[PDB]
Structure 1
């Protein structure tokens, strides 16, 4: 809920992280949108 310079497994970027309603299948780690960009990510240390 705060603006941060994140890095998940080398996916560097800037934004706000928030608990999603998205339901990623076990083999997926990144979710993307129409503009070809990750808008959802699985947190490696907790799998949320």
Structure 2
């Protein structure tokens, strides 16, 4: 989890829609859905193969 970072205003979540997201400095592009996955207490993102 992140401690120090710069001044960008936050924006409300938009789900089930092709958006440009920015989560803690992770720029990307895709649609967002609620998840049933399980993370570690300290984990921030998950990867694939």
Distance in 2 (CA, whole Å) between partners of 1:18 and 1:33 is 17
Name the larger-Rg structure: 2
Structure of higher RCO (CA pairs closer than 8 Å, 6+ residues apart): 2
| Residue ranges of structure 1 left out of the alignment (5+ in a row) | 35-48
Question: With structure 1 as the length reference, what TM-score do the two structures score?
Answer: 0.66
Q: TM-score when scaled to structure 2?
A: 0.64
Unpaired runs of at least 5, structure 2: 1-15
How many residues align? The count is 34
Counting only pairs closer than 5 Å after superposition, residues 1-48 of structure 1 correspond to structure 2 as 1-34=16-49
Report the aligned-residue RMSD: 0.6
